[PDB]
Amino acid sequence: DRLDAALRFQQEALNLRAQRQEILAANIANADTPGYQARDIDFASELKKVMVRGREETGGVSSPAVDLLYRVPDQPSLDGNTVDMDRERTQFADNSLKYQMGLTVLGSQLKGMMNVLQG
Amino acid sequence: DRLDAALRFQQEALNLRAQRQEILAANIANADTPGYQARDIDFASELKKVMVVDLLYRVPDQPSLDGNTVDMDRERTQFADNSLKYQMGLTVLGSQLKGMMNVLQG
Amino acid sequence: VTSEQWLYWLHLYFWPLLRVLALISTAPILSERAIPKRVKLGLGIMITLVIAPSLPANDTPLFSIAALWLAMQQILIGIALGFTMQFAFAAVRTAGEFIGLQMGLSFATFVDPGSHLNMPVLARIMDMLAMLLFLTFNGHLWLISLLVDTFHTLPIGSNPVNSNAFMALARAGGLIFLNGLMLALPVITLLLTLNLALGLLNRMAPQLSIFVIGFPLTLTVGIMLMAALMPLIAPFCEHLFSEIFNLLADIVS
Amino acid sequence: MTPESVMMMGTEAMKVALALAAPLLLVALITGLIISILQAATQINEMTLSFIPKIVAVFIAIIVAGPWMLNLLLDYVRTLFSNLPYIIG
Amino acid sequence: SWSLSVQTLVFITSLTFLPAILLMMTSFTRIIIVFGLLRNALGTPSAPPNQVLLGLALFLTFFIMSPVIDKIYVDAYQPFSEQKISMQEALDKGAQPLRAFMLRQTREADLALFARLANSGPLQGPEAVPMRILLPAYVTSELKTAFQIGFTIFIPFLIIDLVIASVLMALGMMMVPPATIALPFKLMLFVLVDGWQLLMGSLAQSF
Amino acid sequence: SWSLSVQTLVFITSLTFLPAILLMMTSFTRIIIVFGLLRNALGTPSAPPNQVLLGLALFLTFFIMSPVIDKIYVDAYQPFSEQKISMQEALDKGAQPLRAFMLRQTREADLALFARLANSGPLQGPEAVPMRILLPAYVTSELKTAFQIGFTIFIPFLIIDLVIASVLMALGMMMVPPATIALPFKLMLFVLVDGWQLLMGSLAQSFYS
Amino acid sequence: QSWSLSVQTLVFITSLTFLPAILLMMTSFTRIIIVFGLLRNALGTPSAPPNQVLLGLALFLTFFIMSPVIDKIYVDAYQPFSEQKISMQEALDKGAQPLRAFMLRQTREADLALFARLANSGPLQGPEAVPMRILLPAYVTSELKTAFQIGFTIFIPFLIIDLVIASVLMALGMMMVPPATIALPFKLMLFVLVDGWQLLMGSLAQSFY
Amino acid sequence: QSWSLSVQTLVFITSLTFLPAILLMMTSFTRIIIVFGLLRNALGTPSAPPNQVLLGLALFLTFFIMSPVIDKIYVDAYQPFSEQKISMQEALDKGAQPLRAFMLRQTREADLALFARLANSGPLQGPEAVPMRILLPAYVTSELKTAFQIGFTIFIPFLIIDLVIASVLMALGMMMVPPATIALPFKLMLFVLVDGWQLLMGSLAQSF
Amino acid sequence: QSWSLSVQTLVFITSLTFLPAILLMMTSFTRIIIVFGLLRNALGTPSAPPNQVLLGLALFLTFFIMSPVIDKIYVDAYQPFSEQKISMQEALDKGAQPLRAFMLRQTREADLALFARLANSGPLQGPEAVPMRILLPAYVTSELKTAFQIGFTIFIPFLIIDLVIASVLMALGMMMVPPATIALPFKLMLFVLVDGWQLLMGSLAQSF
Amino acid sequence: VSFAGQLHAALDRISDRQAAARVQAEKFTLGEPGIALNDVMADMQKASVSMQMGIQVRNKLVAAYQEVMSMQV
Amino acid sequence: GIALNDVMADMQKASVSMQMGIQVRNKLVAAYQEVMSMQV
Amino acid sequence: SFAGQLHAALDRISDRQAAARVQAEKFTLGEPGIALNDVMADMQKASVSMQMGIQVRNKLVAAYQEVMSMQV
Amino acid sequence: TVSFAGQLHAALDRISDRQAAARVQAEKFTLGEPGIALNDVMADMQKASVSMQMGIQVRNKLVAAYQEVMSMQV
Amino acid sequence: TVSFAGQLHAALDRISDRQAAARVQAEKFTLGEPGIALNDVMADMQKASVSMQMGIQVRNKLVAAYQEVMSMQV
Amino acid sequence: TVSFAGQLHAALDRISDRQAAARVQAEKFTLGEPGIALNDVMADMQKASVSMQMGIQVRNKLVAAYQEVMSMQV
């Protein structure tokens, strides 16, 4: 209980990082599909929501209970998709580094605990 | 050895790709020899034979006057394809060896 | 897929392992230092592997004071079982040491109590004879079976506990003495008579007796007496084991 | 294996111990009794002169009967170790 | 509330001092010394094994601490779950029954000596005695109590030994050692009166 | 069959449990306990520097388990090495001779107890006993046999001390320690009656009987 | 001039290993436990209070005795260390002085002179200039001698009791009665009625002053 | 035919793990250490010389006793192997010979016969047919028996002193004294006036 | 010829590993430790001075006794090495000489002869050329013999005290009064009055 | 059904995935129609990830077993 | 299905909890053996 | 006294850990003014302090066990 | 009649002949002898490396098991 | 009269001096001092690390020797 | 006449000569002395490292074995 609660914030943040990267990869894959609005999630609000109330799924075809918001387009396009590649690749790299940061923090905490349980 | 049986297929494919690469480059080099026939091997049949070489003449497309049947475009495409497949075989064999290694490392 | 929920398996395999290993480290013959530690650990692990899947798994986290209370409960149960079993061998050792002390085997204790000079060799003889008898009567299998059975009576989950029950185990401390006398009452009595006889010899011409004629005679008489008395311990051995076992069954619940 | 066998081997063991210890103890007892009755006859009483001949007598006892004890005990141990794998349970 | 890893470190560190807690804080020393003296009384220093005496003292200690354990459970074990009180404050609240017990079992002279050994002048009240002054005083009081109980146990066995020796001397025997004769009579007296159960009852009454 | 990477992984992992196989499935356990008990008996708790006893026990176990190892090699290791039997079947084929040795020596009472503790159905013949029942039954039988052997071993070395103490007490030397006198005599006995050849042969017969 | 943080941490953790050595050879502990080791012999019960009880009681008594020295070390040396006004080298130099004075006041001059002569040291102007290599073993020697003096003096009343009881037993013709078992309860009486433990600890604490 | 250098390095560095086992089971270390432990037990004090001193002294004695065998191995195996004149396996086979002779010279016949019986050996023939896996346990058993034979007769003079002192003390009348307490200084006196250490080393060396 | 720096530090750490063996078998630690143990046994107090106290006392006494040898090693061997004047090999060779001389001063010629004859060493002219492998075991044996001599001699006054108290008790008829209980306080008094600790340490130092 | 059964199932699944990827790669190298290089490369990637997962599980499991066998009894 | 993120996190916890249980039991067993190795 | 100093040291170490954890938590939410290098440096400093505490505990426990194992 | 020493010798031989075969193939390819291909040289070298890693890991496991068995007390 | 405490103090002072010199040079280089080069800073830091590691290892060996000697039974 | 200390000294000296030779070769190459090739310099440096690591492993095994032999209870 105590150990589960202490490691729950970073674990949930890392899971939300994984889901956000899945969404960003879906946006990158559909970058040339005509009529596809780019989707993204508000990381902070959804992270607080998942902590107060546990993770939930729409079904389980299954998917998370996250709110898929639409990204504001930069410039218009005749085909009708709002996937701007610069934004997609910047968010992808930023999410990558933040996921690596979460892995580093969680691994440091778990070693910081094995060190104690080490006699 | 069991280690040979796992890596036999990729090693034989890599060696066959190298041999066919040499044959295609020989076809390119002898493009100007009058009376030279363009030779090639059937990769799949020879791979069966080695896993379980004979040179086959290429069917000419255009009739030249000096008897040379080497076509530039066909063999250039085949040469590029063989280079790509040699790289793919190297990648697959390296991945298998690296997996066998990380199984042991510890 | 590829779940392999680890916490469920850990909580299912941990507490039965704690109780089995707590019994192992204290139960006679299974707790003797001659066994390598890894053999004992493996026996506990295998017994838990056999038993645990049938039991209802607990879900209390290992990182809680409830886990500490559970561990204390398992340790208490195991050590109580092992010690209640050990009481019988304590009684046999007491009877043997007293027969040996009436032999005059270690006279230095009467003059220097606890002076690093004591050899209860008869106590050791009858202790190892009692261990052999316990091995013959398959008492250890019973111990393992009762360790398993105390679950149905007292499940892993934290349950409330009683009091005078502990006294019972402590009051079992009387048996070691009581039954001990029951093993020494015949032979010592005749030895007593022999000593009385020696007294009659000392009522004659003063000195010139005892410490010169009494010791060898009483030593030989004790030797042959209790050599003849050896066949007697086995019914008393079974009586002791039955007493310990049904006291355990009555009080553990 | 049977408890009868266990008690039989224990009894035989301790009778072997009795046979090993009986000559020395009996010799010491006889020497002590003889010295005591001589003291009573002569009206002499010191608790130390009975301790002197006892040591000499008991030490001579090993001279005379020592080989017999050593041969008996070795035979007992040899037979016990040889019959060990047939009384296993 | 401080860090979980620090809590784990402190908990495992405090687990090491468990023999110290058993000996210095509980009554285990008293029962163990009483058992040792009683064994010395009967004339047989190896009749019950040291292991058995230690385990019997452990069971007696567990029973006689059961009220204090219950008070700890009420004041510390339960509210730590409901989180009305927790952490070091709850630890101190749970340790409070141990003080009360150790104040009950400690003499005033030992506490006075250990206070004047620490220059603690303004120690006026009796429920605010620090642990540093309370612990060794409690141990010394336990030693004195155990020695007194051991002497009380010694009295009847000494009487029996003296009586046996006197009858041997009066009957004319001057060489027979009285210990050999008196040992079985000591045992038959100990068993017949059922010495063990009354001894444990008195120890429980002795608090 | 498994991929070669999986086979190598399984082989390397299974190489870890060798001490467990030696201790819980082999003759080593009742080949040691006897040595420890005998060392406790002679009064020299160090004497044969352990390592010496461990090496002797290892050689004895190797000499004793030879037919079982031979049967495993001829039935399981040889077909597996010749690519006739898969890796996941060589283990099953080789676990049978070891299981049979584990039975030839495992008592009944233990088998009945551990058949009852698992809530398993009736076992009309020994061919229905799984390894989950035979393992701890064999372990308990080996422990009991080792302790029986050691406890009948202990008797003469205590007999000698008894007679030594009695002889010392006959002459009134009540303040002479008997252990110091008895230790050279116990060593003399263990020298005379081929202390080790008889014990070695008795243990080896105790396995093959 | 200050040491680096890594070197300071290394030195601190290395010096943490010498805690039992410092406690035995520099504090009061050596005089206390030794006396206890003799007191349990005087009472006739080698078992006595358990070993751990006596060790912990000695530890608490030692802490109470060295409370002034510990306070002086905390004030003069460690407080500037925590408040950053001193280095580790200067703290080590300054904090030892009160402990050196405490060791010197209980050090016999003869032992100190012996260890000087044995180290071939030059003329020491005054107590303040005595090296620690000379003060440590001399303090340990004087500590042992003082502990033996206290123990022998303690051995007196129990000897009185044993002699009186033996004389009473022999004057009545009860020659065959071992007086140790009879006199043990009276030794316990003497230790109980006079409050032996509290008196002894008070005497030890006053002796160190 | 020769092994590759990588294989040679692997085998060489793996074989160093059996160095304590070789020293204990195969050399003279076992007998000397057992005799030394028995002598402390016989001195009346169980730990007078620390285990470290006895272990180092036994190591030096073992080296001095085995120096001729080491020289023979160096001449036969180490030197021609290091000069790259023989292979590793053949060097090991050649170097096993003097050690085999040393082990045989101190091996009881009954031990070898028993361990050949347990190893199914049938027509053995020349003393030069005993395999290493049969010779080694027989050598260990013979060494244990010989060490016990030496120890139980090392015990004799101290038992003589103990019995003489106890008999004199009790016959004189003082039967309440502990004889061992008075006897220990006399055991030390006997050990130092005989030159017990020097003579014991001489006897242990001559035993081979 | 000078070892490279990495080899030098490898040698230094490997030599630091062997420190307890050097302390026990090359210095005066062993003799002092044996005498202290025998003295503790002689007073009838088997555990009065804790082992750590006696070990620390023996270590300090050994340091004081070996201070001249350490000073000679520093001045002659270590100081030039620390100033890069000489290499590690020659520094070690120069540092061996004072320690050997000290060990030769405290060895017995008979033990040296025994170990020389056992090791089949050729005739050695004078004490100048004696190998360390020969000198070390001989020095250890001589130290053991000397320590036993000192302990046996020390055992005498306590034996006198025990005998006189036992005789005084026996002449009074007190047949069942053990003399150890009366002798222990008087042993403590005797050792205190003669200033036993400092006198014995001074005697041990003077014998070196 | 049991822990050993679950481990055997995991090993069989991982080996089956690796063999499927290898067989598809050999089929592509053979020249048979319909097999795309994209699928071959992605399946090899997935097989490598699964192998690494199995290796990590084995490493931990061995570490836990070593920890338990160090437990004092 | 369950992803590596959850599998690895629960795997690590379980390892941590098992190590904690082992260490606490070792402390308890050491304390018990120290108590029983006493001398009364 | 000594227990007070130990309590103060433990409190300082736990305050280190709590500050590092809170800073990392705030940075995870995207709060401005907290930089990654500061977070990593604080995490490493907290780890170093905790390791120092563990080592001190180990030395103290070993010293206590060695002291309590003496033969009076 | 199985032999563990014989089995270890056979395994060490297998590794050593694999390494020697790869080395000789590299020898001939460096010397310029026709018929030897560079990819075959590299593949054989990597196979020898894998075999030696096999041997090293088995050595580690065997040494650890032996040390843990021999560190036990009877 | 050579004392071991003096030698240990000298070694600790040398390690501390090397570490302090490396730290000071790195601090000066960070502050933009002209006459200091990066390669020298890194090499000095590595040398200080090597010296401190040597000190740690010597301390470990000394502590092991002391704990072995003080664990005797005299 | 075989002395193990002599063989240890010989091996240690041989390692030292290899290291010194590699160091001097690198020294000379840096000073631009004609006749020295970079590939041979690196090869000899790696051989020196291999020899030193072999010495380290041998020392580790010997020290471990000595500590296991020297800690037995006699």
Author numbering:
A (entry chain Q): 3 to 62, 78 to 136
B (entry chain U): 3 to 54, 83 to 136
C (entry chain E): 4 to 256
D (entry chain D): 1 to 89
E (entry chain F): 37 to 243
F (entry chain J): 37 to 245
G (entry chain G): 36 to 244
H (entry chain I), I (entry chain H): 36 to 243
Give the text the authors published on this PDB structure.
The bacterial flagellar motor is a huge bidirectional rotary nanomachine that drives rotation of the flagellum for bacterial motility. The cytoplasmic C ring of the flagellar motor functions as the switch complex for the rotational direction switching from counterclockwise to clockwise. The basal body is made up of the LP ring, MS ring, C ring, rod and export apparatus. Here, we present two high-resolution cryo-electron microscopy structures of the C ring-containing flagellar basal body–hook complex from Salmonella Typhimurium, which are in the default counterclockwise state and in a constitutively active CheY mutant-induced clockwise state, respectively.
Given the high fragility of the C ring, we examined several reagents as the media of density gradient centrifugation in the purification of the intact C ring-containing basal body–hook complex in the default CCW state from our previously constructed ΔfliCD strain of S. Typhimurium, which lacks the flagellar filament, thus avoiding effects of the filaments on purification of the motor. The LP ring acts as a bushing to stabilize the rotation of the rod, which serves as the drive shaft. In the intact C ring-containing basal body–hook complexes, there is one more peptide loop L3, which consists of the residues G310–P322 of FliF and is also extended from the β-collar region of the MS ring, bound in a hydrophobic groove that is formed by the α2–α3 linking loop of FliE6 with the D0 and DC domains of FlgC1 and FlgC6 on the surface of the rod.
